[PDB]
Design a protein around this ligand. Structure first.
Ligand SMILES: CN(C)[C@@H]1C(O)=C(C(N)=O)C(=O)[C@@]2(O)C(O)=C3C(=O)c4c(O)cccc4[C@@](C)(O)[C@H]3C[C@@H]12
Ligand SMILES: Nc1nc2c(ncn2[C@@H]2O[C@H](COP(=O)(O)OP(=O)(O)O)[C@@H](O)[C@H]2O)c(=O)[nH]1
Ligand SMILES: [Mg+2]
Lengths: 33, 335
């Protein structure tokens, strides 16, 4: 079973934290599953 | 209670599984980081290349240092807007400096230049950068240490004396493992006492060992049920020491969250809830501040009336007669 790591996006408002979060999720599934 | 706005998403890379938080506003980040609601083994600092660092950028990094986030990876976003190799290099230098300012290795810190927007739209030249970031999540953040691998720590929730067998302390093992026969220390409040685990029971079923996460009862060799004071903890000898003075970051609930209506000033002596009890303490605010408003977060040096077993990162509540008025994390112990 895979190691589990907790991360998160911090930074100033409107700099892209949430959009990047969506991107990570998308690109990763698309590429590895 | 504390109002908290968060997003929790999970995803995978070929070798690891990730749990990722994202909060809408600055206040959320503050509340989350301090209350430990959202704990992080590593953080992704997002900085729009168009605006460069900003106040919250700085504040988040500082908060990170304070609450104990060990690593930070940077993602220069909105690069699909800039096109001056010169400009970007500028922003980077700014950021690395900024990280170094707060003791993060600004030089060795990975910085990916990308575009969250384009990547999301499907443009593969940009999706590439997302994969690069993921690579750093995998390589840069070391695999975190599991609860069971840490030294034994058990916050005592109650005490009992079972006839002819001895004194039984109960509680949930916070971390590590305790095996019958092992020697343990009782630390906090009074002077550290030593003893031997002569047994581990759980609803009469006799056990071998008590493991992190389990609600067990630990049997102690010759130590009266009255020598145990509320607030003390059971721990692997020499792994945790009692302290009274520490520096910390705190969030003071707003009126709406059910906190104070009025600000407090120097000389405020509230009670600090550590695991199981309140412990009164004095407050040293930073220079220049003479009053703290409800809803503010502030650096604060605290001095406890009795010593409590603690290490960097321990969370606590500030209470005014049972009522919770604030929450904090121990940024660094002093004595
Ligand atoms: C266009 N976009 C997708 C959304 C939006 O309309 C936003 C806005 N400012 O108008 C966001 O900020 C929006 O992009 C955004 O940042 C949102 C959030 O960050 C979160 C987080 O982190 C946690 C819980 C809920 C939200 C959220 C529902 O407010 C998110 C809404 C996002
Ligand atoms: N051009 C461009 N716009 C972006 C990029 N990432 C995010 N945005 C936009 O910037 C806005 C703020 O992004 P958001 O993720 O909501 O920022 P947050 O407040 O940090 O969550 C959103 O409307 C996006 O459309 C990017 O890489 N390029
Ligand atoms: Mg957001």
């Amino acid at each position: 079973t895979k190691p589990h790591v907790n991360v998160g996006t911090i930074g100033h408002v409107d700099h892209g934290k949430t959009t990047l979060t969506a991107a990570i999720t998308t690109v990763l599934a698309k590429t590895y599953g | 209670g504390i109002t908290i706005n968060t997003s929790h998403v999970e995803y995978d890379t070929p070798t690891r599984h990730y749990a990722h938080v994202d909060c809408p506003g600055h206040a959320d980040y503050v509340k989350n980081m301090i209350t430990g609601a959202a704990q992080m083994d590593g953080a992704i600092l997002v900085v729009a290349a168009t605006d460069g660092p900003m106040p919250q950028t700085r504040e988040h990094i500082l908060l990170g240092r304070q609450v104990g986030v060990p690593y930070i990876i940077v993602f220069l976003n909105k690069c699909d807007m800039v096109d001056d190799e010169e400009l970007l290099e500028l922003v980077e230098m700014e950021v690395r400096e900024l990280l170094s300012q707060y003791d993060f290795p600004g030089d060795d810190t990975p910085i990916v230049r990308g575009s969250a927007l384009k990547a999301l739209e499907g443009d593969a030249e940009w999706e590439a950068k997302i994969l690069e970031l993921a690579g750093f999540l995998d390589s840069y953040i070391p695999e975190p240490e599991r609860a069971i691998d840490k030294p034994f720590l058990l916050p005592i929730e109650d005490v009992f004396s079972i006839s002819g067998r001895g004194t039984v302390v109960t509680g949930r093992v916070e971390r590590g493992i305790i095996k019958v026969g092992e020697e343990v220390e009782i630390v906090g409040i009074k002077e550290t006492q030593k003893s031997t685990c002569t047994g581990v029971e759980m609803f009469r079923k006799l056990l071998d060992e008590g493991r992190a996460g389990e609600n067990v009862g630990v049997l102690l060799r010759g130590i009266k049920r009255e020598e145990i004071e509320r607030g003390q903890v059971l721990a692997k000898p020499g792994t945790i020491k009692p302290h009274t003075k520490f520096e910390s970051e705190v969030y003071i609930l707003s009126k709406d969250e059910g906190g104070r209506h009025t600000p407090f000033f120097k000389g405020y002596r509230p009670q600090f809830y550590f695991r199981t009890t309140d412990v009164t303490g004095t407050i040293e605010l930073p220079e220049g501040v003479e009053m703290v408003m409800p809803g503010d977060n502030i650096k604060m040096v605290v001095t406890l009336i009795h010593p409590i077993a603690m290490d960097d990162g321990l969370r606590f509540a500030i209470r005014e007669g049972g009522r919770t008025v604030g929450a904090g994390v121990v940024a660094k112990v002093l004595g």
